[PDB]
Structure 1
Amino acid sequence: EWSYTNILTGPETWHEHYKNMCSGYYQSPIDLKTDISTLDLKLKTVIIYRNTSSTETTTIQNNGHSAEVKFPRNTWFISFDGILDYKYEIIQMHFHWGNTDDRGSEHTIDGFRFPLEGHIVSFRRQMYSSPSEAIGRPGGLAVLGIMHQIVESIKYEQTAFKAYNNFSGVLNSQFVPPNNSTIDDINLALLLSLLNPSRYFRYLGSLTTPPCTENVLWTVFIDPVLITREQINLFRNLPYGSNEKQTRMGDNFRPIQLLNPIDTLASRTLYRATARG
């Protein structure tokens, strides 16, 4: 299959093992360059919102490459246009992090890596009726990237882990793949309120794992939410799957792709949003 740390199956090989579409020219992640991006004032504040009549359980799984929160259907949503009419429905949230505090994110901002990048994955329910219809089809997906940065002095209640409800304690050395547990729901609205939801990069790109499908509308918020060293080390306690060379989970990020590889047949543009000033 594929891995992050086994040189035989790792990211440098994906273009060959998964030509469709890891060999394409609209890949992610990229370096988000503030100076080489176009400000687009039409891009509105992002809203995350919940169907309050949903009662189904949230679960989490160590799938061998990340910790992935699976949300029940019809429960959490994204609006990019201020209307709460269920155009984008959230499916899951997973994470990318480093062996050390100075790396881990997949995207960079002006060359800078964060310790932890969370990915809220949604499908365009406006057009497609289910996650499995959308996931392999054009324009099917929209992902939100949330950067986290480590602070030494902070109350629990002001960290991202309050929104995550500490993942109900599941991040530990005994959370072996492919175990899954029920967890308290993640308050994704609170999470979003920990940063500026108007201030983000926006571009068309891909999944960052095989098969690297080029059907993702990316939104990467510029301001990070805050965590402690203790919290980042929790993720580091998870074991990798048996496909990986490294034992403990870490450095589960894809290397940086160019916005426009030289063989592109139609250049893409990196956009930036900011609040109505």
Structure 2
Amino acid sequence: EWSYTNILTGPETWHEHYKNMCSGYYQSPIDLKTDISTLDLKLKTVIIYRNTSSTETTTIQNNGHSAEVKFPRNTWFISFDGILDYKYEIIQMHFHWGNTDDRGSEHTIDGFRFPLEGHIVSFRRQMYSSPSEAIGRPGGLAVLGIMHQIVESIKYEQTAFKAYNNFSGVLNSQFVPPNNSTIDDINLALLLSLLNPSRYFRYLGSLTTPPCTENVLWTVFIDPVLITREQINLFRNLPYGSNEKQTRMGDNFRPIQLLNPIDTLASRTLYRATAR
């Protein structure tokens, strides 16, 4: 078993308890270094889009380590090439945050931590027929990282919580693991429009929880969307699962991994995109 906050099962132990693949050399998260990265003008604007025929419900669960929104199949998609032909299908979105406002994100940008990093997880439907087929297979997944930053003066409608529809009020101290609830759908298109979808880091990496599978195409947007202190504190009301030492959920982020650990057998490169 694993945790964030119990020293015995925490992130420093994952390379031993889950050798495949938390001991690998293409792990995430990393520090996204603007100066070190390679600008690749070929990397296009990201588009998130919905199947307007889909009517099934969205749910959210406290899984003991995060709040995880589970989307119905065949409903939300990502395009990286401008074509709306269902190459990447979104599965779930979950979040990583801090006990305090100066930490929480998994990635850093030039060493800087944000209070809340959201991960929109998709599978390469272009190749694999289902999430369960893709999740353990090479090149199966693509994850979007969305940084959030706290502002003191803002209307609700301009915060990320408008896109999330406040998660239908489920973020509270009574939302105990492993409870799940039906919630209003998340307007992921609106969420993406709150930042610049052309301006992002891109690299090949891993899941950031065990078993840390090295099959994730990462895109991390540089500009954050905006939330309030009230909204970050809602996440902090969730209780951790019983695997954890800490009672309230927070600091559910993995430590930074190197782009190229010294034992790598083929270095990877950190790429960056910007608008045309």
TM-score past 0.5 threshold = yes
Shift of 1:86: 0.1
Matched, 1:45 2:76: no
CA-to-aligned-CA distance 1:195-229 (integer Å, 9 cap, x gap): 00000000000000000000000000000000000
Shift of 1:246: 0.1
Shift of 1:159: 0.1
Shift of 1:63: 0.1
Shift of 1:133: 0.1
Query: TM-score, structure 1 length as denominator?
Result: 1.00
| Cα distance in 2, alignment partners of residues 212 and 169 from structure 1 | 31
Q: Secondary structure at the match of 2:164?
A: helix
Aligned residues: 276
Q: Secondary structure at the match of 2:186?
A: coil
| Cα distance in 2, alignment partners of residues 17 and 146 from structure 1 | 29
Q: Secondary structure at the match of 1:242?
A: coil
Shift of 1:109: 0.0
CA-to-aligned-CA distance 1:25-75 (integer Å, 9 cap, x gap): 000000000000000000000000000000000000000000000000000
Structure 2: gaps spanning 5 or more residues: none
Query: TM-score, structure 2 length as denominator?
Result: 1.00
CA-to-aligned-CA distance 1:160-192 (integer Å, 9 cap, x gap): 000000000000000000000000000000000
The match for 2:174 is 174
The match for 1:61 is 61
| Cα distance in 1, alignment partners of residues 178 and 100 from structure 2 | 25
| Cα distance in 2, alignment partners of residues 180 and 210 from structure 1 | 22
| Cα distance in 2, alignment partners of residues 58 and 72 from structure 1 | 6
| Cα distance in 1, alignment partners of residues 275 and 179 from structure 2 | 41
Q: Secondary structure at the match of 2:21?
A: helix
Shift of 1:251: 0.0
Q: Secondary structure at the match of 2:231?
A: helix
| Cα distance in 2, alignment partners of residues 215 and 176 from structure 1 | 31
CA-to-aligned-CA distance 1:135-168 (integer Å, 9 cap, x gap): 0000000000000000000000000000000000
After the TM superposition, which segments of 4 or more aligned residues of structure 1 sit over 3 Å from their partners?
A: none
CA-to-aligned-CA distance 1:100-120 (integer Å, 9 cap, x gap): 000000000000000000000
Structure 1: gaps spanning 5 or more residues: none
CA RMSD of aligned residues (A): 0.1
| Cα distance in 2, alignment partners of residues 135 and 78 from structure 1 | 17
Q: Secondary structure at the match of 2:191?
A: helix
Shift of 1:126: 0.0
| Cα distance in 1, alignment partners of residues 272 and 86 from structure 2 | 24
Q: Secondary structure at the match of 1:168?
A: helix
Shift of 1:2: 0.0
| Cα distance in 2, alignment partners of residues 233 and 212 from structure 1 | 28
Identical-pair percentage: 100
Matched, 1:142 2:142: yes
